Design a protein around this ligand. Structure first.
Ligand code: ATP
Ligand code: MN
Ligand code: MN
Lengths: 336, 19
């Protein structure tokens, strides 16, 4: 693992220092249907004309990015995503910009959000949850080794591919940082207490978020929920967690160590780092190399009808993609 | 039950990032 990460860093740093730019243009694609929206972007299924391949095109309105104070975040998002390379990270295939918008064209992950399956099924079995959790553990090990913090782990940002494995999308809050950072960002249910309390924080927040994810996958609801974010934050900071009756003793132990307010006690953040998690009893059956090599049989594989099938995604209201004859925010996004 | 309370709550749909 230590040789692997060393080589992986060399590869990442070359691309980090000299990023890819302007590798496609809008008229090379036919836009088909919206796959998802979020606070910032719209992601559309598109067909690349010259190849016939389908992709997922994230479209960011430059003026909205500026309004929502996401300039640096969006530049981070693209710079990091074009530089990373890992089996459970979605691949950025092209990126480009026009007068009005920024575009990031990713591999289309057709199995849908984990979110939709989780809500429909209700909850995942512990082996099912563990399979996904192991992929996230390996991905964070990779990202943290590159000095990256991810900061938006949630089922809505996790896609299921044709083999039933996870693809992490949405690097909107990802940041390369060696020290502390202070930005209040993420999604309410998944925020670590130290973010809420306006403290400097570090990559330990991703391990907290993993605790929340595992809990939600196995329970079918988050460990801290309420009608409004303010009410959720009060629950998070108190830190009191109650577990479903069906949770194994091993799972409860793991979660007590991940959903730990005390940073000196939180798994992932101690002397042994990620190995405290990898060697925990809950993961005793996990073959970590087999997961990385994608040789483990997935517990669930979504139904796939054919190329361009969007059956695993909700329907969204469509909007015209507008491109002004005047360049917007040219200097701000020069490096994009 | 906690499940019933969650399903009757206002945050069972997709959650977007804070902004
Ligand atoms: N590569 C992909 N393949 C298929 N669908 C995708 C892909 N990337 C994103 N999506 C879908 O589009 C949605 C929105 O994308 P994304 O999460 O990047 O937008 P956002 O505006 O940054 O969201 P957030 O509010 O969480 O910050 C995702 O939740 C997912 O449903
Ligand atoms: Mn998202
Ligand atoms: Mn985002």
């Amino acid at each position: 693992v230590k040789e692997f990460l060393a080589k992986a860093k060399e590869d990442f740093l070359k691309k980090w220092e000299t990023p890819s730019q302007n590798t496609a243009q809008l008229d090379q694609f036919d836009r088909i249907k919206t796959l998802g929206t979020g606070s910032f972007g719209r992601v559309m299924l598109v067909k690349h004309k010259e190849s016939g391949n389908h992709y997922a095109m994230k479209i960011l309105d430059k003026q909205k990015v500026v309004k929502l104070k996401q300039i640096e975040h969006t530049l981070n998002e693209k710079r990091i995503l074009q530089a990373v390379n890992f089996p459970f990270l979605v691949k950025l295939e092209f990126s480009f910009k026009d007068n009005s918008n920024l575009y990031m064209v990713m591999e289309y992950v057709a199995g849908g959000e984990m979110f939709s399956h989780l809500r429909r099924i209700g909850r995942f079995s512990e082996p099912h949850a563990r399979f996904y959790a192991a992929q996230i553990v390996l991905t964070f090990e990779y990202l943290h080794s590159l000095d990256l913090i991810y900061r938006d782990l949630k089922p809505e940002n996790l896609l299921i591919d044709q083999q039933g494995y996870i693809q992490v999308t949405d690097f909107g809050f990802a940041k390369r940082v060696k020290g502390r950072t202070w930005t209040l960002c993420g999604t309410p249910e998944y925020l670590a207490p130290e973010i809420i309390l306006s403290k400097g924080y570090n990559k330990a927040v991703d391990w907290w978020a993993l605790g929340v994810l595992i809990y939600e996958m196995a329970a079918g609801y988050p460990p801290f929920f309420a009608d409004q974010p303010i009410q959720i934050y009060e629950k998070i900071v108190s830190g009191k967690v109650r577990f479903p009756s069906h949770f194994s003793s091993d799972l409860k132990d793991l979660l007590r160590n991940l959903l730990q307010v005390d940073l000196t006690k939180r798994f992932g953040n101690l002397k042994n780092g990620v190995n405290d998690i990898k060697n925990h009893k809950w993961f005793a059956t996990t073959d970590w190399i087999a997961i990385y090599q994608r040789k483990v049989e997935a517990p669930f594989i979504p139904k796939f009808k054919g190329p361009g099938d969007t059956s695993n995604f909700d329907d969204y209201e469509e909007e015209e993609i507008r491109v002004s004859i005047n360049e917007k925010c040219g200097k701000e996004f020069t490096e994009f | 039950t906690t499940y019933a309370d969650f399903i009757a709550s206002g945050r069972t749909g997709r959650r977007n990032a804070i902004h």
